[PDB]
Amino acid sequence: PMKASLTFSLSGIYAPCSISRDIYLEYGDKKAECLYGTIRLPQYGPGCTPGKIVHCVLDDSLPFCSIVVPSKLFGFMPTQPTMDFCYFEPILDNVVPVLDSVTFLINEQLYSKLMDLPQEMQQIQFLHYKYNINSMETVVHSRDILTSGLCQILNCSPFPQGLVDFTETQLILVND
């Protein structure tokens, strides 16, 4: 794990993380569109945030040792500042797993929208237009709050985080 200076993006929970070129160099020959890492934030006193897997993309314009991460990935969104670095670890030997199912807890308005679609394949495609969930690319995580009061991931299976295969992963929708 390396320490990297941290900037929080405010453009959706599933915006990819941007990493500086020195971090990108740690992956070597890996395919530049398929990069993942684990992020943990430092916490009040001992210990740190639990490891969260994210898709990362090179941003050549960032200064050294820098990452940009969505603030919505973590407990609260910054209305006042907090901590100026994170612990970042590239994923090198491993690949990221595909979920068998994802369960969304959604408000009545969104549920009706999803329910006026007779097909499951277009239910995930609809969430893909609303939220930048991309098949076999975006990592989703249990308890992710996509929009306060509208949409939250209740659970994933068999792992608490992983990729969504639009043709394979099962979508479970729960009215709130």
Numbering used by the authors: 0 to 175
Give excerpts from the publication.
The heterohexameric ATPases associated with diverse cellular activities (AAA)-ATPase Pex1/Pex6 is essential for the formation and maintenance of peroxisomes. Pex1/Pex6, similar to other AAA-ATPases, uses the energy from ATP hydrolysis to mechanically thread substrate proteins through its central pore, thereby unfolding them. Pex1 and Pex6 belong to a family of type 2 ATPases associated with diverse cellular activities (AAA)-ATPases that form hexameric complexes consisting of two stacked ATPase rings, D1 and D2, topped by N-terminal domains. Unlike these better-studied homohexameric AAA-ATPases, Pex1 and Pex6 form a heterohexameric ATPase with alternating Pex1 and Pex6 subunits.
To structurally characterize the Pex6 N1 domain, we first used limited proteolysis to determine the boundary of the domain to be amino acids 1 to 184. We recombinantly expressed and crystallized Pex6 1-184 and collected X-ray diffraction data to a resolution of 1.9 Å. We then used molecular replacement with an AlphaFold atomic model to determine the structure of the Pex6 N1 domain. The Pex6 N1-domain consists of two subdomains: a double-psi β barrel in the N-terminal half (N1a) followed by an α/ β roll subdomain (N1b). An X-ray crystal structure of the isolated N1 domain from yeast Pex6 showed that despite limited conservation of primary sequence, this domain shares the conserved structure of the NSF and Cdc48 N terminal domains. Structure-based alignment of the Pex6 N1 domain and Cdc48 N domain shows that Pex6 N1 has more prominent loops in the N1a subdomain (arrows) and an altered position of the N1b helices (arrowheads). The Pex6 N1 domain surface is largely hydrophilic and has a negatively charged surface in the N1a subdomain and positively charged patch in the N1b subdomain. In addition to more highly conserved residues in the hydrophobic core of the N1a and N1b subdomains, we observed conserved residues in the extended loops of the N1a subdomain (arrow) and a cluster of residues between the N1b helices that form a small hydrophobic patch (arrowhead). The atomic models derived from the crystal structure of the isolated Pex6 N1 domain aligned very well with the atomic model based on the cryo-EM map (RMSD 1.604). The biggest differences in the models were related to the loops with high B-factors in the crystal structure, which form the interface of the N1 domain with the N2 domain of Pex6.
